[PDB]
Design a protein around this ligand. Structure first.
Ligand SMILES: Cc1cc2nc3c(=O)[nH]c(=O)nc-3n(C[C@H](O)[C@H](O)[C@H](O)COP(=O)(O)OP(=O)(O)OC[C@H]3O[C@@H](n4cnc5c(N)ncnc54)[C@H](O)[C@@H]3O)c2cc1C
Ligand SMILES: [K+]
Ligand SMILES: [Zn+2]
Ligand SMILES: [Zn+2]
Ligand SMILES: [Zn+2]
Length: 750
């Protein structure tokens, strides 16, 4: 007949009141025949089914329009409840006066906007003006506000919230808005964003590194937010909003105050959204998914809430991983000091700046696959432009002849065919049955020649050696030390999509910015790490002590292998096994300046040219030459020494290497004259005491798991980062960077 209590058992509202006033005969406080429940604080009367029935007035027309729009654009059931929550419920804003921040209800006729939300204060009516007395900020908040903070409140919310006008929507066209936390009432009848930022997978998309499914929660997120196990849509909307905001301005720290005006949804529920967005924000900051890169955070205010646990970290080694970890922890507000052995930062990033017109890396200078790459993000932050490698790369023979591209492509096809047979071969072989990749390739080759009856020319044979020498460059070893089973172990995980680029200005630009304003001690080689006390005791070569609650080790694989730091307690037999299972690959580089760009008429502006080895024994000797000025004005070539070639250049001094390179170029350019170079460097990484390598690879008998094992923290106090520590992205500045962010994440939690 008529009731004064809600329809739902155990509902906490003693006196339901109708939030709509659609009906001529709306039961304001009194008895409807049925009180429909939206949430604990939100109810409407059976008369305000002015909307539902065909016979009833300025309801049915509005409702039916919404209903058609709802049905086609989204996949949620249309109902009067859904209508009320999408179309009718009042909005709630917080006061923007910083000292106040109180939640207030708006009168039904108001549509919330980011303009309103940025500027609202306790008092003001349908017009923006600050009131006069600032006394409205003293009034207590409507009692329903406090309830929304309890977890039982979300239990009693009959429909999940759907966000309006999410900055994330342009990026999410392929999805049903409601599947992704946004309102099917899409009125939006993205440019400017960096082409390299593609945060979201398009539906049913295969592995592309660092993409998030916008419609599914990852297990990491579930552990932290167990309440979204059944219905993740509220969580997903907020994370997606966060990602979209961060990538639309990655130059500034993303804060809750920045996020809130972009959260538009009617009802008391907006209060749970604004509370959750802050919790999600801190989670994603700690994980390094947001508020990261070369982001400098100012004096007083840091990226995570003040904790008072007095936690401190010593970080060993100031390369990319050390610096990534150091920067993150610092930004968090954790005390960090960095001990570095060398008289400079950067480790395997080292950029020569003395060549007029260019920066040439002694170490890293390329970015393989920019899409979602943090290196791309940091470039955007620093406003620097990378150069994308063109496809053209002619293979010049000794004598001057240019190898027809059809040979090139064919021998590459054959080389790959060989590698495919290896991946079939390995299918069932255990670790203990592994075989050098070099051995296996030859075997398969020798068989392939024997079965087919194919005869290759001398030149084809030589080009096949060129392609083999690239694999060796990639590994940093002659293939005879590389595992057939797990050489490309990491290619099972999603890899970095998009452009391969020359980081023209240098990785040093990113490195120096990461370091800026941190406590870095140079000329401080660590000799001993003692973690048996309440504090970690870190002792330097010349005897200086440093102490901290936690320590992070980022020293190169070559140096864990040699055990140059003494750990007490020792590292576990398991860990040593892992460490010794990986190889410390090596390449060297040479740079040459010339008085003019002698190669221009022959090379015609391509980023690089290749050098066909005259035999198997000369395989990695200046295999490739690089034009270090994509603007084609300055005169600097760069070349690499890989594989067996490294070993042969070991008895030669810098001048003798230079003479060998010159002789090599003059063969490649026989038909013409090549000038003497005027400035050069030859790189000696393998003998650089505190580095002794270029990048890790997996040796015969080894497993991609060794990276995971090296990364495992010890008693939650000794942590490991570094290139040889990142199973997904093994060799790169990128993987190094990400490993340092990974360990900071671990540390910041406890
Ligand atoms: C010639 C060359 C070319 C390369 N090409 C590329 C490329 O094009 N693109 C790419 O992404 N990567 C490239 N790499 C690999 C990349 O440089 C590294 O993988 C990356 O720098 C990872 O380094 P890291 O973070 O482990 O720290 P690192 O750079 O390896 O070094 C960490 C620091 O540890 C310090 N240290 C060691 N022992 C101690 C100790 N006991 N106490 C204190 N400090 C210590 C070292 O001095 C060093 O400063 C190249 C490397 C080389 C050498
Ligand atoms: K009516
Ligand atoms: Zn009513
Ligand atoms: Zn109720
Ligand atoms: Zn106020």
């Amino acid at each position: 007949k008529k009731y004064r209590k809600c329809e739902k058992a155990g509902c906490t509202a003693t006196c339901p009141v109708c939030f709509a006033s659609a009906s001529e005969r709306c039961a304001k406080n009194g008895y409807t025949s049925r009180w429909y429940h939206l949430s604990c604080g939100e109810h409407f009367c059976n008369e305000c089914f002015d909307h539902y029935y065909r016979s009833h007035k300025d309801g049915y027309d509005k409702y039916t329009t919404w209903k058609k729009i709802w049905t086609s654009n989204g996949k949620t059931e249309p109902s009067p409840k859904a209508f009320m929550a999408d179309q009718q419920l009042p909005y709630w804003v917080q006061c923007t006066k910083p000292e106040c921040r109180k939640w207030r209800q708006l009168t039904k006729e108001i549509q919330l906007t980011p303009q309103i939300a940025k500027t609202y204060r306790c008092g003001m009516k349908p017009n923006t003006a600050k009131p006069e007395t600032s006394d409205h900020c003293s009034l207590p908040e409507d009692l329903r506000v406090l309830e929304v903070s309890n977890h039982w409140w979300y239990s009693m919310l009959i429909l999940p919230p759907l966000l309006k006008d999410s900055v994330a929507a342009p990026l999410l066209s392929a999805y049903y808005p409601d599947c992704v936390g946004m309102s099917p009432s899409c009125t939006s009848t993205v440019p400017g964003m960096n082409r390299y930022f593609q945060p979201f997978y398009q539906p049913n998309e295969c592995g592309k590194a660092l993409c998030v499914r916008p419609d599914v929660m990852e297990l990491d997120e579930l552990y932290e937010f167990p309440e979204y196990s059944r219905d993740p849509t509220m969580y997903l909307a907020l994370r997606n909003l966060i990602l979209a905001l961060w990538y639309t301005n990655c130059k500034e720290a993303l804060t809750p105050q920045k996020c809130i005006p972009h959260i538009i949804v009617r009802g008391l529920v907006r209060i749970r959204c604004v509370q959750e967005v802050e919790r999600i924000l801190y989670f994603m900051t700690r994980k390094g998914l947001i508020n990261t890169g070369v982001l400098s955070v100012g004096a007083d205010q840091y990226l995570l809430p003040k904790d008072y646990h007095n936690k401190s970290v010593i970080i060993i080694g100031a390369g990319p991983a050390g610096l990534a970890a150091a920067r993150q922890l610092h930004n968090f507000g954790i005390k960090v000091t960095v001990l570095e052995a060398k008289d400079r930062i950067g480790g395997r990033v080292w950029d020569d700046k003395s060549f007029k017109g260019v920066t040439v890396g002694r170490g890293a200078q390329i970015v393989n696959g920019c899409i979602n790459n943090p290196v791309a993000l940091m470039c955007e932050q620093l406003g620097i432009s990378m150069h994308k490698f063109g496809e053209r790369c002619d293979l010049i023979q000794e004598g001057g002849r240019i190898t027809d591209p059809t040979i090139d492509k064919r021998m590459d096809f054959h080389f790959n065919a060989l590698l495919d047979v290896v991946s079939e071969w390995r299918k069932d072989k255990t670790q203990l049955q592994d075989v050098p990749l070099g051995e296996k390739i030859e075997e398969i080759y020798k068989a392939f020649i024997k079965e087919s009856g194919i005869q290759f020319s001398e030149l084809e044979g030589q080009v096949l050696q060129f392609h083999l020498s690239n694999l060796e460059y990639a590994c940093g070893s002659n293939l005879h030390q590389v595992s057939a089973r797990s050489w490309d172990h990491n290619e099972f995980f999603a890899q970095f999509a998009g452009d391969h680029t020359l980081l023209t200005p240098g990785y040093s630009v990113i490195i120096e910015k990461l370091a800026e304003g941190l406590d870095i001690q140079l000329k401080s080689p660590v000799q001993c790490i003692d973690y048996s006390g309440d504090e970690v005791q870190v002792t330097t070569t010349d005897g200086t002590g440093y102490s901290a609650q936690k320590v992070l080790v980022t020293v190169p694989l070559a140096l864990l292998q040699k055990g140059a730091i003494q750990f007490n307690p020792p590292l576990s037999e398991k860990k040593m096994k892992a460490i010794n299972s990986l190889g410390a690959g090596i390449i060297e580089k040479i740079a040459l300046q010339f008085p003019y760009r002698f190669w221009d008429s022959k090379v015609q502006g391509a980023d690089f040219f290749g050098h066909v080895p005259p035999s198997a024994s000369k395989r990695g000797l200046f295999a490739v030459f690089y034009d270090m000025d994509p603007q084609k004005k300055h005169s600097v070539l760069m070349s690499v020494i890989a594989g067996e070639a490294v070993a042969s250049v070991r008895t030669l001094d810098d001048k003798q290497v230079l003479q060998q390179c010159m002789a090599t170029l003059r063969e490649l350019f026989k038909e013409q004259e090549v000038p003497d170079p005027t400035k050069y460097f030859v790189t000696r990484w393998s003998t650089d005491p505190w580095i002794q390598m270029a990048y890790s690879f997996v040796k015969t008998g080894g497993s991609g798991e060794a990276y995971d094992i090296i990364a495992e923290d010890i008693q939650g106090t000794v942590f490991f980062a570094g290139e040889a520590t990142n199973r997904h992205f093994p060799q790169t500045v990128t993987g190094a960077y990400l490993s340092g962010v990974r360990e900071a994440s671990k540390i910041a939690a406890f």
